[PDB]
Structure 1
Amino acid sequence: MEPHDTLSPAQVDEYRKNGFLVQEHVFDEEEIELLRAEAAQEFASGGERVTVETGIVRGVHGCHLYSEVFGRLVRSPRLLPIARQLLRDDVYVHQFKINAKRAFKGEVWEWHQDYTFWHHEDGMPAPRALSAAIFLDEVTEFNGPLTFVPGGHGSGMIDADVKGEGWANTLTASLKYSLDVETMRGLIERNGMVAPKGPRGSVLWFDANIPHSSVPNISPFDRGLVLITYNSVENKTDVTRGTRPEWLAARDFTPLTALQATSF
């Protein structure tokens, strides 16, 4: 395994200022293909962990608990050291999901901050968490990229429209916690909007509290993302306020260590 990867000090500053950062070409084509094959197996076999958009498969959750490939992936030397660097802690996986947007398909995903769900549904005490979204496909202007407000995370958590009982609607557009509208307007007047792009195999890191949204893929090309949410071990969720199963909100808080090279 290559000496553990870390972000330069410019990259860190950029991440902290903006709330997101892209690293291009972290994984190669062959690596990505292995991940897409496994994603396809998880979509086939994940049962109640799958989510469907009038639709074929949209999301699958919790895969690192069931898939040896994905269990390894979260420990990768390409990912785990950066998670540790940005969270300034040992880390574990709170949540793992795979979100596809097939060619000419997709939905408008309502503007929202991931930490609002994790705090209220799972008992996350602070927003000392982030997500790594691995691009299974090139992310362009036209296949529904994640779209952020740069610097929007500095609001902390934002008072939010609630819709629904339990958690079923946390995985749908339509979302339980959405940002409706003066909120967004001022945000965007103050801060703007950016949809980071990148080639297949890139990684997009983003803050637990950054607002984000995405639109439909009007391209003839897919937009598959594998999203790993790392949380600080010190920031472990309070399992006594927890409302969701292990494959949405982890309860094993053992600090993660990196994969090492073996002959198999």
Structure 2
Amino acid sequence: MQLTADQVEKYKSDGYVLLEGAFSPEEVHVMRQALKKDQEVQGPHRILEEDGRTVRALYASHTRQSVFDQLSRSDRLLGPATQLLECDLYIHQFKINTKRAFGGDSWAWHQDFIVWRDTDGLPAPRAVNVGVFLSDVTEFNGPVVFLSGSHQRGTVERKARETSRSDQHVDPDDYSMTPAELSQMVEKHPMVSPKAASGSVMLFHPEIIHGSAPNISPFARDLLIITYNDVANAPKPAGEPRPEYVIGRDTTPLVSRSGPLH
């Protein structure tokens, strides 16, 4: 148990918490090399920007690169995730949102949970998102922005857009917050953005409202997000389940491991 009482309180009240410097520069380098290799793999798990010039998102890199499997079992991620949820955990979703320098596109304002509830039959928000900065995150390269404390409202109901932006995953556009909702909410739940060097870890709640702007800077923003889910909270889909690359199916409890990534 590494999170302090203050850190757990911040997660409960504000919906997110930043752990700076969890991984060393050398460990970041190993992960970036594995990302460069994984970005070249062909398949439906690889989502391009709308302009087709770069990758926008990669799914399930932990099934293809050893270091990302190691990362997902590291006690530096699972320790904190287990403190917050107090249960056995497994990977519901593993993604890297690779927002390129010089025009990497935005991510619409949204909550995560309603998407998984309505698309995948996820019963409850008994999950936690764990971000790992593979780039330095600054005000300039399209950081995740949270509406602080906005998870306390619970789920803000909406229907999925008639047509989907992508047939490879659910882009948050499909379930985006309306301008009216965001305008009402922001007075009590102000915009905040964790900013820190690569190797930092960011935990955030599946019902916090979050989004991010285009990256006009000369610096990329590669953000890895592992969504850990309570093994007792496995999805119960209505129709055919979505692919395993986007929605995890192996509910074996993960056992944390210590030591450096390689």
The alignment's TM-score, normalised by the length of structure 2, stands at 0.92
* Unaligned runs of at least 5 residues, structure 2: none
Which residue pairs with 1:232 in the alignment? 230
Structure 1 residue aligned with 2:156, among 115, 135, 158? 158
Q: State which of 9, 13, 17 in structure 2 corresponds to 1:17.
A: 13
**Deviation of 1:197 (Å):** 0.8
Instruction: Determine if contact 2:44/2:168 at 8 Å carries over to the other structure.
Output: no
Name the CA distance, whole Å, in 2 between partners of 1:187 and 1:169. Answer: 31
Corresponding residue number in structure 2 for 1:208 = 206
Give the alignment partner of residue 66 of structure 2, picking from 53, 65, 68.
Answer: 68
One-letter identity of the residue aligned with 1:252? D
**1:148-184 deviation per Cα after TM superposition (whole angstroms, max 9, x unaligned):** 11110011111225214576274446x2111112211
Tell whether the 8 Å contact from 2:19 to 2:202 is kept in structure 1 after alignment: yes
- After superposing the two structures, state which structure 1 stretch, 161-170 or 146-155, moved more: 161-170
Q: In structure 2, what is the Cα distance between the partners aligned to 1:19 and 1:130? A: 10
CA distance in 1, matches of 2:239, 2:74: 31
The answer to whether the 8 Å contact 2:106/2:215 transfers is no
Corresponding residue of 2:31: 35
Q: Write out aligned runs for 1:48-197 (5 A).
A: 48-53=44-49, 54=51, 55-164=53-162, 168=167, 170-172=169-171, 175-197=173-195
CA distance 1:211–1:261, change in 2 (3 Å): closer
8 Å CA contact retained: 2:75, 2:257: yes
**TM-score for both structures, normalised by structure 1:** 0.92
Distance 1:72 1:242, change over 3 A: farther
Contact 1:146 1:212 in 2 (8 A): yes
Q: Secondary structure at the match of 2:195?
A: coil
CA contact (8 A) 2:47 2:168 kept: no
Kept in 1, the 8 Å contact 2:123–2:235? The answer is yes
Residues 87 and 219 (structure 1 numbering): CA distance in 2 closer, same or farther, change over 3 Å? same
Distance 2:168 2:97 in 1: 15
- Percent same amino acid among aligned pairs? 40
Q: 1:243 aligns with which of 226, 241, 244?
A: 241
Letter of the 2:9 partner, please give it.
D
Structure 1 partner of 2:255: 257
- For 2:252 and 2:32, locate their aligned partners in 1 and report how far apart those are by CA, in whole Å: 27
Deviation at 1:66, TM superposition (A): 2.8
Unaligned runs of 5+ in 1: none
State the AA in 2 paired with 1:44: E
8 Å CA contact retained: 2:125, 2:207: yes
Aligned to 1:44: 40
Aligned residue identity for 2:167: A
Count of matched residue pairs:
258
